[PDB]
Amino acid sequence: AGDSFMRDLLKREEELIGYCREEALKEPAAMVEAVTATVWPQNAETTVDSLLSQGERKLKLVEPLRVGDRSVVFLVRDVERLEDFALKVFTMGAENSRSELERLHEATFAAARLLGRLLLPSDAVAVQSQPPFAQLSPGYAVANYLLLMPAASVDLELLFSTLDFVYVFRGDEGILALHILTAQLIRLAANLQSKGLVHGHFTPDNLFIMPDGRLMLGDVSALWKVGTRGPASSVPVTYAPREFLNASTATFTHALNAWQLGLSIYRVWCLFLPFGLVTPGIKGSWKRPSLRVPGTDSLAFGSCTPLPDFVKTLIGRFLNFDRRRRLLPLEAMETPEFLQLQNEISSSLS
Ligand SMILES: Nc1ncnc2c1ncn2[C@@H]1O[C@H](COP(=O)(O)OP(=O)(O)OP(=O)(O)O)[C@@H](O)[C@H]1O
């Protein structure tokens, strides 16, 4: 800890992060406004039934936090436990949304039971007097299925867009934070590997710095035992290596997460993705939709924050296009480069 530095950094920039979080809610403000009124049509405090206990809970809106591709996540206060929670609400664009959410619920909580570094939901609730999972009234269709979980301080996607939106002088502290986040990402991916696990989206919208400064991975339903076959489409296309883009069914391998780790470290230092891949929310991004389509396939560091050579080497080995020759995170931790990374950090923190 390490973690402590990041905890303190996040606290000191709480106001800048809040500003950028508010800024990111403007393009999708239509969506946000409609969903808020669906869940809190009256006065900010809604009673819901738990789908796990048929206990009740009383949830007060504090503020919207983030919009996703298929959801809005709010900060809420459980007024009987005096604790804040993130609450994720799902939109129902997909024709089979209701069945998809019932499966997601069953899968998520069966996996969470088994387990008890992963950010897990602790409850799922539904507005009273309307059936669970069905479109929630008063109707941007929203499902009557609201997922309660610990609130992250920031997801990495927001951290990157915060770094991109406002130039802020951070001096040596900022550079140290880039080293620490790099080390934290490598240690989290190595923890997956040591357990023979692979996550389908080790991606910045699912990597979270919690209030204690620790990095966590969300969405347990997208964990796989290594070597398992599953739908390639479950990997976001800009974070998929070519071996995933080329099949309907793919094998979930450690090489996937080495690739995804390489992309996130590249974003820590560069904010946009490499290889010209489209990176919404970041100014420097090019517009290539995936590695399926031709483009520039060499690594470019010219527009990044200046990177240590040992970081460039690590990124380059994680992003080897040959899945057989791609460096894995546990082996990365035994390389001279990772040792230089650790020692840079240790000597700056002393
Ligand atoms: N527990 C949480 N605390 C804080 N922010 C969260 C939490 N869970 C999710 N978020 C953020 O909310 C946004 C939307 O969530 P997420 O990206 O998981 O959903 P999505 O985009 O709708 O679905 P998917 O990512 O699986 O396609 C993201 O910025 C994410 O990091």
Ligand SMILES: [Mg+2]
């Ligand atoms: Mg997302």
Ligand SMILES: [Mg+2]
């Ligand atoms: Mg998610």
